[PDB]
Amino acid sequence: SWDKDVYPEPPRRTPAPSPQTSLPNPITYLTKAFDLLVDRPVTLVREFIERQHAKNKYYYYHREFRRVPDITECHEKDVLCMFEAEMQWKRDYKVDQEIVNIIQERLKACQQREGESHRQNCAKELQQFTQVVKAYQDRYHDLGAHYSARKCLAKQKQRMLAERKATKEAA
Amino acid sequence: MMTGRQARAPLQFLPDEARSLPPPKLTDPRLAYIGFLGYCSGLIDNAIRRRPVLSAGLHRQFLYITSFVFVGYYLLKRQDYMYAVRDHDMFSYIKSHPEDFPEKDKKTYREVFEEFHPVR
Numbered sequence A: 001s002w003d004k005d006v007y008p009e010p011p012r013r014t015p016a017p018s019p020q021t022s023l024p025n026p027i028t029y030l031t032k033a034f035d036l037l038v039d040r041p042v043t044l045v046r047e048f049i050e051r052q053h054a055k056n057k058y059y060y061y062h063r064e065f066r067r068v069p070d071i072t073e074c075h076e077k078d079v080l081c082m083f084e085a086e087m088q089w090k091r092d093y094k095v096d097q098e099i100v101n102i103i104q105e106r107l108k109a110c111q112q113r114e115g116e117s118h119r120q121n122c123a124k125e126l127q128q129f130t131q132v133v134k135a136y137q138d139r140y141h142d143l144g145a146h147y148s149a150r151k152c153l154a155k156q157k158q159r160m161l162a163e164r165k166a167t168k169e170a171a
Numbered sequence B: 001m002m003t004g005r006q007a008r009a010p011l012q013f014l015p016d017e018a019r020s021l022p023p024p025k026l027t028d029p030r031l032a033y034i035g036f037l038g039y040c041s042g043l044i045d046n047a048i049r050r051r052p053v054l055s056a057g058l059h060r061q062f063l064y065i066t067s068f069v070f071v072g073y074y075l076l077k078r079q080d081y082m083y084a085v086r087d088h089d090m091f092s093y094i095k096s097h098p099e100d101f102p103e104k105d106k107k108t109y110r111e112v113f114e115e116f117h118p119v120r
Helices: A026-055 A079-113 A115-121 A123-140 A149-169 B016-020 B029-048 B058-096
Strands: none
Touching: A079 A115, A079 A123, A079 A149, A123 A149, B016 B058, B029 B058
16 A cells, blocks of 8 residues: 555546446456456465465664755865765755656656546646756756766856846846 | 985984884785795796796795795885884974964855856
């Protein structure tokens, strides 16, 4: 099972079957055969395996990283503090990449699920994708194969200088 | 370079100030490599005279290894002493001339400015 808030999904609404004709549809008979011959033995085997798994129980944990000071409060050419800040920045870079992956998966799921009316019913997913892609592009794009926290700090400083000049010339 | 240092007490392999330093261990990796050099020279000495390389004259190979270890130990003692003297002179001159070695005003990255060159 997963968390239904990070991966949302609307409630399923299926119509009732109305046999207008008198011809028996083979799909109901095939579903009966599938439940008799396939679903029952697989369910029994999984029950046995889960019983074997419940005899001994051990846990694995999600690794927690405490926050260290970032590169903005590191002295220049101070390898210890800069090393810790660089490792933290790389971890957040990986997490941001997977956040963009999550939003992309949401968008693809909406496009497949809504059917032919996807252009109207997937407006919110498109807006979320556009916003998160704009944030990712403003944060991490055009850094090169040798990206580091200093490059990202320089890019953010240049963008902030451009924004300050733009708001000065528009004042 | 250091002739003024090695000018008041000339032709001394190891001056009396060297005895304040820790001697190299007999398990020094450099000493072991020098012993391996001695063993290799013993094997070459067996080889050029058409003797069985790994069997003939074990006393000769033992004397080769022993001589190399002895000379290498004393050379290592001198090398460690001379690097110690280098560091001692460097630190004394740094401390004696504070005007020429000022403390650099270190600044954090929130104040420094670096130009950004995009890779596109």
